[PDB]
């Protein structure tokens, strides 16, 4: 039995008392409960049950409809280059670029959410981004990734993009909104992935030498890797305040607004209803909409919520890094001629091919060179023997007669 905590009580993680539709009923309370169990071993059992909605007023069961995106949201964050070198509050802000995959695949994290609509429904042809105060829908086709030239996007899900990029010094992620306006974010990133094996090739072969390599799996499933999430900070909005003749009028519009004025009387407060600040000017006041019903990635580009302390949750992420196999081509066997304690090879590489050799005695004297084009190599074969490795081929061994 795995146990979770709620205020002064303990309960089974998979069975919170709020069920069914914990989040739909009380969004703030559900997220607060999840944050209180972040360190508990049964946190993911609680996350699954709390973010699943199978209501009573329904014929069928939707007990497998766990959707983490009902609690999370796309956001606006700092980007140093939104185009032409100018910084902006970007709806496609770059968070982190991961390049641990030896196959060259890049795992990119952005402020928007791909494959999710504003109503939380999953749709691969759609994308959701933060448009001013409210999230909006955009096309997946308009999404692009580029370094020095365009990238091949291999997978997209939520805040994550998988891409195969050519050599570059910057990384750009962009999209086209509903109003046909292009939005992009550029970060300095040195991309020049190392060679898998001993041959620098362009296209992936169907057959070849099986070599160990790592990749970010194209599986949409989120089971191993994770990110930290928390409630967003107060969202500043000047449009909430208006000048009522010669005073300040704060219109909430069915929202929870935190206000503060540089005037006397009831100048501050967390209001759910409309408030008026008499003998005050609109410039002397600060107004912001609170977000206690939603979760957001623990972004260093967004400020922390001042009200709550170190309160945080965690969510599983798609495309984890995994050990796989990479197929590499084997360079064609060279034309070999012999001489007294000497081997002559006529190398004809189709791409950069690594040539290495060593003596099979006490003094190996290891030597290596990357063969770019047609080159004749003269090698001395000692009495002990000579071992020659030409690209991804198995080592050739030579001995004198």
């Amino acid at each position: 039995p795995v146990m979770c905590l709620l205020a002064n009580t303990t309960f089974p993680c998979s069975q919170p008392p709020c069920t069914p539709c914990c989040y739909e009923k009380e969004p703030e309370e559900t997220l607060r409960m999840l944050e209180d169990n972040v360190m508990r071993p049964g946190y993911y059992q609680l996350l699954q049950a709390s973010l699943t909605c199978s209501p009573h007023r329904q014929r069928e069961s939707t007990k497998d409809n766990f959707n983490v995106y009902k609690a999370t949201r796309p956001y606006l964050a700092h980007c140093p280059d939104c185009g032409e070198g100018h910084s902006c509050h970007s709806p496609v802000a770059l968070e982190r670029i991961r390049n641990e995959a030896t196959d060259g695949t890049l795992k990119i994290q952005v402020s928007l959410q791909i494959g999710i609509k504003t109503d939380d429904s999953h749709d691969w042809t759609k994308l959701r981004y933060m448009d001013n105060h409210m999230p909006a829908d955009a096309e997946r086709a308009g999404l692009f990734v580029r370094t020095s030239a365009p990238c091949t996007i291999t997978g997209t899900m939520g805040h994550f993009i998988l891409a195969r990029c050519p050599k570059g010094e910057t990384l750009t992620v962009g999209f086209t909104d509903s109003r046909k306006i292009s939005h992009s974010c550029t970060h300095p990133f040195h991309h020049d992935p190392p060679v898998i094996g001993r041959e620098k090739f362009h296209s992936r072969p169907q057959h070849g030498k099986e070599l160990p390599c790592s990749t970010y799996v194209q599986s949409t499933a989120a089971t191993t890797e994770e990110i930290e999430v928390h409630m967003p900070p107060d969202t500043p909005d000047r449009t909430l305040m208006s000048q009522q003749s010669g005073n300040v009028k704060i219109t909430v519009n069915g929202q929870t607004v935190r206000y503060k004025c540089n005037c006397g009387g009831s100048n501050e407060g967390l209001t759910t209803t409309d408030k008026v600040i008499n003998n005050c000017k609109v410039d002397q006041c600060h107004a912001a909409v609170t977000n206690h019903k939603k979760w957001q990635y623990n972004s260093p580009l967004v400020p922390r919520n001042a009200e709550l302390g170190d309160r945080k949750g965690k969510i599983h992420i798609p495309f984890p890094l995994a050990n796989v196999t990479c197929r590499v081509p084997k360079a064609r066997n060279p034309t070999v001629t012999y001489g007294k304690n000497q081997v002559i090879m006529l190398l004809y590489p189709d791409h950069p091919t690594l040539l290495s050799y060593r003596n099979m005695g006490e003094e190996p004297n290891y030597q290596e060179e990357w063969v770019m084009h047609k080159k004749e190599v003269v090698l001395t074969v000692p009495t002990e023997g000579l071992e020659v490795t030409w690209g991804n081929n198995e080592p050739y061994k030579y001995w004198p007669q």
């Binding site: 007294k340 099979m360 001995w399």
Partner: protein, 393 residues
Amino acid sequence: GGYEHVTVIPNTVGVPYKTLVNRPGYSPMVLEMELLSVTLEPTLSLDYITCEYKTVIPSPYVKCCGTAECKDKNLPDYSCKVFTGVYPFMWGGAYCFCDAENTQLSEAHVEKSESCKTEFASAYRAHTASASAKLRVLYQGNNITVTAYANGDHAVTVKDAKFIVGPMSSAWTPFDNKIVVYKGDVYNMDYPPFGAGRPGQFGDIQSRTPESKDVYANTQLVLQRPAAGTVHVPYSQAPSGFKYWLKERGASLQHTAPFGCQIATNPVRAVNCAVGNMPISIDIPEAAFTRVVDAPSLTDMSCEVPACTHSSDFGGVAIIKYAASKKGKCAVHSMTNAVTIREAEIEVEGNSQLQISFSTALASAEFRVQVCSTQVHCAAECHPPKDHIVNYP
């Protein structure tokens, strides 16, 4: 009550060696021995593992109209700084009500990256390797495989024949006291001890075990003042030491090791290091032998060499005529060390002839062939081969 045959072969894999077993009063026996593999497996003691680090940076604490306070947190490379006079902006305007007296608390720490389970290098303390050998023996017309420790103590019995392999003439190993393992590659490296790793170098992050919760970190992490009206956590840090080592490691032991060593992992071992010789002890059982009287007697022997080429392989052909007393199996062996015969045993019957394959380096090869208990002289004029270089030992 068998017979112990003791011989010494060079520690070279893929070379068949012929040994003549001569038990007094018993017909000679020819045994073919070939080393299939020689494994040197060192005892490993894991010091730590290293991988790419992760700089954990949460949302900065922007205290509007107040002063934030940094506290000492027991986390690897924990960095905390409170910046005064900040006025950050969000899309809809200023985040703080106050013009002055706003502070930003920037905090960061280092931990293992999500990649550490998949992409990692292990630091091992390698000591006193146990030598093992796989030997193919052509015994009684059949190939038998003997796997034994080459210490001269481990007795392995196959078909009643007791085998004692070693001790190795050379105690040489391609592995140093300290080694580093990355996937299928092994490196001789005097790696920094745990808690001594340098920034941007191998060991900038150190984890005793891959499951370890607490890690050592020395990445030179320094937090910087954020840009005017900008919410972000700028910092300076030395790049991943593991990522740097991956490109700076050079060629692994499989490519650099002397004596043609092959290097394998899971477990870490040196395979087919052609160094020194290997003594072999075979306690051949009583039943395997045939008495001289019970074996055919050969007379009127003559040898003719119609074709010979002096090379590393069996380039010589010899036709030996004989007069056998009875039908039976006879052992074939060269009495001259400069010539070696491919055949170990042939069937004889009366006034007939046998064909053997021989290898020699001599242009004028004069050698004696012992078929059963009778010797025959072979005169051979061997010619040079087409190639000065060959692809077999």
